[PDB]
Amino acid sequence: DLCFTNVYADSFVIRGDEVRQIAPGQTGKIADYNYKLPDDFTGCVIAW
Amino acid sequence: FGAISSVLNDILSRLDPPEAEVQIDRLITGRLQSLQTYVTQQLIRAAE
DSSP: OOOOSOOOOOOOOOOGGGGGGSSSSOOSSIIIIIOOOOTTOOSOOOOO | OOOSOSOHHHHHHHSOHHHHHHHHHHHHHHHHHHHHHHHHHHHHHHHO
16 A cells, blocks of 8 residues: 555575675674665565 | 763764664753753743
């Protein structure tokens, strides 16, 4: 029931022992030199 | 007021922004309430 101007789909694969870094306000190798989500990130992190 | 240390540079240096924001926001709540208290005391005393 929500509209959006533009929805982004960022795609990559990682290990289950690193999912926690793909989230707002985290730390680590990924959240340092690979991929960092904003502090006010508004969205969902999905993985299978 | 429920923060870590009552020094802003200390909080900002010790912690990362994702939590410095919370500790700060508590410091801000407290200091703003103290300012309101002082300004209201001044208002009443100036009326007298």
